[PDB]
Design a protein around this ligand. Structure first.
Ligand SMILES: [K+]
Ligand SMILES: [K+]
Ligand SMILES: [K+]
Ligand SMILES: [K+]
Ligand SMILES: [K+]
Ligand SMILES: [Mg+2]
Ligand SMILES: [Mg+2]
Ligand SMILES: [Mg+2]
Ligand SMILES: [Mg+2]
Ligand SMILES: [Mg+2]
Ligand SMILES: [Mg+2]
Ligand SMILES: [Mg+2]
Ligand SMILES: [Mg+2]
Ligand SMILES: [Mg+2]
Ligand SMILES: [Mg+2]
Ligand SMILES: [Mg+2]
Ligand SMILES: [Mg+2]
Ligand SMILES: [Mg+2]
Ligand SMILES: [Mg+2]
Ligand SMILES: [Mg+2]
Ligand SMILES: [Mg+2]
Ligand SMILES: [Mg+2]
Ligand SMILES: [Mg+2]
Ligand SMILES: [Mg+2]
Ligand SMILES: [Mg+2]
Ligand SMILES: [Mg+2]
Ligand SMILES: [Mg+2]
Ligand SMILES: [Mg+2]
Ligand SMILES: [Mg+2]
Ligand SMILES: [Mg+2]
Ligand SMILES: [Mg+2]
Ligand SMILES: [Mg+2]
Ligand SMILES: [Mg+2]
Ligand SMILES: [Mg+2]
Ligand SMILES: [Mg+2]
Ligand SMILES: [Mg+2]
Ligand SMILES: [Mg+2]
Ligand SMILES: [Mg+2]
Ligand SMILES: [Mg+2]
Ligand SMILES: [Mg+2]
Ligand SMILES: [Mg+2]
Ligand SMILES: [Mg+2]
Ligand SMILES: [Mg+2]
Ligand SMILES: [Mg+2]
Ligand SMILES: [Mg+2]
Ligand SMILES: [Mg+2]
Ligand SMILES: [Mg+2]
Ligand SMILES: [Mg+2]
Ligand SMILES: [Mg+2]
Ligand SMILES: [Mg+2]
Ligand SMILES: [Mg+2]
Ligand SMILES: [Zn+2]
Lengths: 60, 80, 24, 206, 98
RNA sequence: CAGGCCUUGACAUGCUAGGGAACCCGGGUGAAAGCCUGGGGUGCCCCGCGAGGGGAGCCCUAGCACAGGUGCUGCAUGGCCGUCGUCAGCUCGUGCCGUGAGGUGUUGGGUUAAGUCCCGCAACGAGCGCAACCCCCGCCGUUAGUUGCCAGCGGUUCGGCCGGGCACUCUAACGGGACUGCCCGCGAAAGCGGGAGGAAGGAGGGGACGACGUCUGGUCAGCAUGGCCCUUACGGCCUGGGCGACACACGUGCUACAAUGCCCACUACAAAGCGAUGCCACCCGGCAACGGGGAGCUAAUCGCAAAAAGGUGGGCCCAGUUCGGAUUGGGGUCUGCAACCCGACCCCAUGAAGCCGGAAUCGCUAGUAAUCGCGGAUCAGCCAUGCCGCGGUGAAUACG
């Protein structure tokens, strides 16, 4: 996550298509779950801390 | 088997440029960074330098070249 | 087979609809 | 490369979420971001009070924010002006205009995060790591605590080669679901690098 | 004929806070047809364990939305007394229609 | 990577300093970024009749302390992951033996999936592991009827459609149930063999869960971080190209080479999931992609939706074919500022290699392999034949 690239958030991307999501926490580009706004790593870390309500370990 | 749609696309950078030439004449060349632009009849007879990513290539345009994009005449890769 | 664009199974596999696989 | 986080392992039974609220799919990510900003501002402020945990609850435009601290006297301030300024920062960050509470932690040595923070501090002060660990485990064990474990990571003593020092006693059954093991983690930023500190405390079973 | 939809991440909280509504509406109101379970909406997230490669790790998580019914017959004005606001539950969300 | 630009900067905190300061709308040039230029507007705090002076934020120029780096080092590191390995192990306390490293325990006999249990023993216990407590699937019950049903009767546009009812199915919370408990035989015991009853036995089936440690294993490119290095560029913005190059070599897969098959028509049975700048019933146009119109749905109540293999009927008649759909020509639809490089989808034409694959080599022991479809995450669109899930049909073999 390069700091200049956090220019990602833009009210004026100049095009809707140039708009891409990032991780709100670590700034990761790839693997960003839309539901949590996080990336997958952060997702697992916070899920493990219990800071994501309702999120539990799944087994079946 | 290509397609675009109705309302054919041409970048308006050179669109006004070429007819600006046509108004008063032919002149010489052009320099265009837009290879995504379709070729239209008013361009015929002119010469357009197209960016291949490195340099500008002097593409001369003829009657049978209409409808293709400029970039098709400016190959980006160097092979053998 | 499943690779023929012009067949029912071709559509089903490719997941699309068309002349050879109507929507009724 | 093994050993899943014990809290995350136990979240269903003998552990509960730090943030408990419901939200929709168009809501969740936002409220989560908010909670994160809250914890992030709180932890970089209230550290000197030794916060072992931050709970967050919501219903509508209202947030619990129950802060668990070893020394509430720090978060209160003089006559309660500190908590005022903190609620001010809270309302300035999130416009929700919500409440705040302070729960004292009895025996801070029975809560893992604080123990880890302790050992971490000692390491940052250039203590003897091995003895810091053994001591900490001892202090944890001497008060309740059917089991305890403390783990320090590499570059112990500023050494060129990373090492891992152990020091655990009692019972720490990580594989038992009903264990109820508090876990905590603290860094140490030193001149030569970073040290990880893990703390396991096992109290009671069923 | 008052429609209620209770949604939450904790089956304990929902199930317990429903019977509060039911018991409050029993004394002041009709037979109270009572909670009908409704299906759960389970959302899964599968994520690689490691930060780098190791595609075979995984360990997915689930986030599940439980539901409840209520739906009290005879919307007595006497019922909304014990009803309206008295509640324990936090992470429960309530929907109401006519 | 090529080219056009920017530097107290795209982001944080602070200092000196001239001047203007909040801010709004234009013009030139340009591929855009940028550079340049012009015009509206002078609220606050104090002093003064006024002119006006000084002043805080904020914004622009110049300088300073700094930002920034996906630049190097994973043998300087944290965290997290892979791995031997879900393997049956690794240790400690006290005692005892040995000058000592160490040993004993943990060896032995029986048993187990198991350092699992039993018996014995200079050992007696204990911890991390095993097992168990957690989840799903199996049978039953209680609680509940916007899902279900001529179970039951009345009505029926005969569709659970209307009345009506929680009996059944289902839904989702709690609970029961299985413990070698009972019988025979063997055994010192733990247990082994068999039988009964039972939905299920000897760990009922599947998950989660992976010890002390090993590989100076992987990752400073997710994040964090020590050290080193660049700071008119190793930072920063944009247009275009590249990550998609092709004489070749390998890995993982897809579709096949057909008759236990391919095609067309009609007809039947599922689970798990997703859905508001969303799923899109139904009507019209279009051969179709799709377009126009438009109902319902905050969704057990509407939609995606068709499940496919299967069944019935018909065609093909062993041929590179009605097998197989690569390649290529042409005409279109949609997303998107934009499909040349380099999207997917539809229609017409084209109709390649391929006749079951050398040496070698892979998976799987039961609802498994094989086979058939269905959904989801990311995402405007999509190169998904990938991944992660769901159900349908459903084998062979294990002497050792
Ligand atoms: K033995
Ligand atoms: K089991
Ligand atoms: K290493
Ligand atoms: K074969
Ligand atoms: K087949
Ligand atoms: Mg960085
Ligand atoms: Mg995108
Ligand atoms: Mg993204
Ligand atoms: Mg058109
Ligand atoms: Mg064919
Ligand atoms: Mg030391
Ligand atoms: Mg594994
Ligand atoms: Mg620096
Ligand atoms: Mg390493
Ligand atoms: Mg490492
Ligand atoms: Mg390497
Ligand atoms: Mg190495
Ligand atoms: Mg095992
Ligand atoms: Mg395994
Ligand atoms: Mg000893
Ligand atoms: Mg000797
Ligand atoms: Mg001696
Ligand atoms: Mg010993
Ligand atoms: Mg030994
Ligand atoms: Mg021995
Ligand atoms: Mg044992
Ligand atoms: Mg044994
Ligand atoms: Mg013994
Ligand atoms: Mg039942
Ligand atoms: Mg309903
Ligand atoms: Mg119902
Ligand atoms: Mg009943
Ligand atoms: Mg276990
Ligand atoms: Mg690539
Ligand atoms: Mg070559
Ligand atoms: Mg050559
Ligand atoms: Mg290779
Ligand atoms: Mg329908
Ligand atoms: Mg039609
Ligand atoms: Mg219904
Ligand atoms: Mg037939
Ligand atoms: Mg036939
Ligand atoms: Mg043919
Ligand atoms: Mg041939
Ligand atoms: Mg043949
Ligand atoms: Mg050969
Ligand atoms: Mg062979
Ligand atoms: Mg096996
Ligand atoms: Mg998609
Ligand atoms: Mg392609
Ligand atoms: Mg698919
Ligand atoms: Zn992240």
């Amino acid at each position: 996550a390069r700091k200049a690239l956090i220019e990602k958030a833009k009210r004026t991307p100049k095009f809707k298509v140039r708009a891409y999501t990032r991780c709100v926490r670590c700034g990761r580009a790839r693997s960003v779950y839309r539901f949590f706004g996080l990336c997958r790593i952060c997702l697992r870390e916070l899920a493990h801390k219990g800071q994501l309500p309702g999120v539990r370990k799944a087994s079946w | 088997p290509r397609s675009l749609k109705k309302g054919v696309f041409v970048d308006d950078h050179l669109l006004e440029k070429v007819l600006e030439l046509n108004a008063k004449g032919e002149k010489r060349l052009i320099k265009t960074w837009s290879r995504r632009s379709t070729i239209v009849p008013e361009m015929v007879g002119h010469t357009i330098a197209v960016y291949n990513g490195k340099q500008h290539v002097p593409v001369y345009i003829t009657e049978n070249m209409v409808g293709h994009k400029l970039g098709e005449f400016a190959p980006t890769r160097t092979y053998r | 087979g499943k690779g023929d664009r012009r067949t029912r199974r071709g559509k089903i596999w490719r997941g699309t609809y068309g002349k050879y696989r109507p929507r009724k | 490369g093994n050993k899943i986080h014990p809290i995350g392992f136990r979240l269903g039974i003998t552990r509960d979420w730090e943030s408990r609220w419901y939200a929709g799919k168009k809501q969740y990510r936002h409220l989560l971001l908010e909670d994160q900003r809250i914890r992030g501002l709180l932890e970089k402020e209230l550290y000197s009070a030794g916060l072992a945990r931050v709970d967050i609850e919501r219903a509508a435009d209202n947030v619990a924010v129950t802060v668990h601290v070893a020394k509430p006297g720090v978060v209160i301030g003089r006559g309660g002006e500190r908590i005022r300024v903190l609620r001010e920062e809270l309302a300035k960050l999130t416009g929700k205009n919500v409440a705040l509470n302070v729960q004292e932690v009895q025996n801070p040595n029975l809560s893992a995060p604080l123990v880890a923070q302790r050992v971490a501090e000692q390491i940052e002060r250039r203590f003897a790591v091995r003895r810091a660990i053994k001591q900490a485990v001892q202090r944890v064990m001497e008060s309740g605590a059917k089991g305890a474990k403390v783990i320090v990571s590499g570059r112990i003593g500023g050494a060129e080669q990373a090492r891992t020092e152990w020091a655990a006693q009692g019972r720490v059954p990580l594989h038992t679901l009903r264990a109820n093991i508090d876990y905590g983690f603290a860094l140490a930023r030193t001149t030569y690098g970073v040290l990880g500190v893990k703390a396991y405390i096992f109290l009671g079973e069923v | 004929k008052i429609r209620i939809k209770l949604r939450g991440f904790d089956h304990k909280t929902l199930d317990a806070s429903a019977q509060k509504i039911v018991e409050a509406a029993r004394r002041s109101g009709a037979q109270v047809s009572g909670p009908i379970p409704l299906p759960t909406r389970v959302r899964r997230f599968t994520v690689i364990r490691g930060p780098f490669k190791h595609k075979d790790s995984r360990e997915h998580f689930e986030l599940r939305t439980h539901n409840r019914l209520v739906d009290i017959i005879n919307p007595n004005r006497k019922t909304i007394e014990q009803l309206m606001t008295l509640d324990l539950p936090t992470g429960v969300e309530i929907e109401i229609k006519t």
